Structure formats: structure tokens, C-alpha cells
């Protein structure tokens, strides 16, 4: 979609910018979580096998 008035444009642009930043933070956190759990797995994967 797209805005129909400049007020709507500003509002939705600010909203999408904030949501983008939030999604970037969540992406980084989830990637860090994946890295940590995979490191823990690799620490003992051979012994598990």
C-alpha cells in the first residue's frame, strides 16, 4: 500500500521505520541465540554421536 495524504505518509513511514529497527534487533538476537545453541551442540556432538 501507499499513503493518500502527507500526514498518512509521515505516520506510516515512521511506523515502518520503527518496525524495521525492531525487526533488525529481533533478527540479531535470534541469530545470536542460534549461534549460542549451535556452539553448545558442537561442543559435545561427537560424544553424543
Amino acid at each position: 500500500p501507499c499513503p493518500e495524504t502527507p500526514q498518512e505518509r509521515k505516520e506510516m513511514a515512521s511506523g515502518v521505520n520503527t518496525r524495521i529497527d525492531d525487526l533488525q534487533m529481533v533478527l540479531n538476537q535470534t541469530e545470536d541465540h542460534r549461534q549460542r545453541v549451535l556452539q553448545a551442540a558442537a561442543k559435545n556432538i561427537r560424544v553424543w554421536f
Binding site: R19, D22, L23, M25, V26, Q29, T30, H33
Partner: protein, 231 residues
């Protein structure tokens, strides 16, 4: 004291005999035998020990004087995680029909008690009393799937209570339970994403994501991912 196999069998038999009388079963609850009994059952593999423990569980769950005591025993077993052990034993095959019958009865009673706990009234009472301690309802897939809408009851009173807990509570277990509940609500009812955003739960969950306790942090990350899954 972790005595020998014969001593363990004799003690288990004594407990099973004592459990026959309903009054003794009700009175013994103070000792909380179920945890040690389940630990012994998991650790040991003797067929005699397993049969004695299963028979003791059947006696405890059948001779209980009151449904309240029966529910307490079932909850103790579920928290001790005897359901998985019973399922594994049932998957395993034995000879005597007594063991199979005891396993089936114990599994049926445990499942019925799990459903009773998963009843939405239990969740409402736990939220009212601040009993966010990873109860079976907090993870029951059917409960969240078929009762997430009820979370909006009392003009979103349940959601307001969850938000207040997530904001004020400092107990890591309580915070993690609240975050997991919020994530479950979001996952089971997408329409509630707007309600959560209006309540501000998104900001609180994001803040708790970087909380000191890793146990709370994991639940917060899961809830945040669930909330941000879809626009």
C-alpha cells in the same frame, strides 16, 4: 540412603501396602514420596522394582479419599515427569498382565488430570493468584489453541494482568512464564497482536529480551519472534 536392590524392593512393597488404606495415603502426602519413588523408578531397571512402583502409583491414584488429594498426587507425578516414563514403559513390552494394566491405568489417570489442569479455569485462577510456575496449562497445546480467545475476557483483563506481571515482576520464573504465555496467546490468536501492541506488551517483551536471567531471556526471545512473525 540408596540401599541395595533387595532393600529397595522391600521398601517399595512396604509403601505399596501402606498405600492400600485411604487414610494412610492421605496422611503420607506430607512426606512427598512420589518424587523419590519416581527418581528410583527412572534410575533402576529391575522388573520387580518397576512393578512395585507402578502398583504403588495405582494404589495412590485409586484409593485416594478425595478428588482434591487425587489431583494433588497427579500434579505431583506430572511435575516429576512420570508421564514420559509411563509412556516409555508402555512402549516397552512385559509379560505379566498386571504391569500392563497398572501402566494403562496410571497413564489414563495422568492424562485425565492433565486435561483437568489444562482447563481454562485453572489458567484464570493461576493468573489471578500469580501462579506462573510452568504448570501443564502453560504449555498445553490444546489449551492455548482452543482458549486463547478467552484471554480477552473481562475487557482484556487477562491480558492486562499479563502485562502488569511482565512489567512489575522481578522473579525470573514468573517473568519467563508471563513471556511464554504472551507468546502462546499471540501464536494461537493473530488478532490479538493489535491488542498486545496497544497494551504495550511489545515494548515490555523487547526490554525483557535483554534481561539478566537467561531463562527469562529465552522465553522473551521466543515471544518476540512469535509477535513479530507477521505484520
Amino acid at each position: 540412603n540408596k540401599c541395595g536392590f533387595q532393600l529397595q524392593y522391600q521398601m517399595i512393597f512396604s509403601i505399596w501396602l501402606l498405600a492400600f488404606s485411604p487414610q494412610m495415603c492421605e496422611h503420607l502426602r506430607r512426606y512427598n514420596i512420589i518424587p523419590v519413588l519416581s527418581d528410583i523408578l527412572q534410575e533402576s531397571v529391575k522388573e520387580k522394582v518397576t512393578r512395585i512402583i507402578l502398583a504403588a502409583f495405582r494404589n495412590f491414584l485409586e484409593k485416594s479419599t478425595e478428588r482434591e488429594t487425587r489431583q494433588e498426587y497427579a500434579l505431583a507425578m506430572i511435575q516429576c515427569k512420570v508421564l514420559k516414563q509411563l509412556e516409555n514403559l508402555e512402549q516397552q513390552k512385559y509379560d505379566d498382565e498386571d504391569i500392563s494394566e497398572d501402566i494403562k491405568f496410571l497413564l489414563e489417570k495422568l492424562g485425565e488430570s492433565v486435561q483437568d489442569l489444562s482447563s481454562f479455569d485453572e489458567y484464570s485462577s493461576e493468573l489471578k493468584s500469580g501462579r506462573l510456575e510452568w504448570s501443564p496449562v502453560h504449555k498445553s497445546e490444546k489449551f492455548w489453541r482452543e482458549n486463547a480467545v478467552r484471554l480477552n475476557e473481562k475487557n482484556y483483563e487477562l491480558l492486562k494482568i499479563l502485562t502488569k506481571l511482565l512489567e512489575v515482576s522481578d522473579d525470573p520464573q514468573v517473568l519467563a512464564v508471563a513471556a511464554h504465555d504472551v507468546g502462546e496467546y499471540v501464536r494461537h490468536y493473530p488478532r490479538g497482536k493489535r491488542v498486545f501492541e496497544q497494551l504495550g506488551g511489545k515494548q515490555l517483551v523487547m526490554n525483557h529480551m535483554h534481561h539478566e536471567d537467561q531463562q527469562v531471556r529465552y522465553n522473551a526471545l521466543l515471544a518476540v519472534q512469535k509477535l513479530m512473525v507477521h505484520n
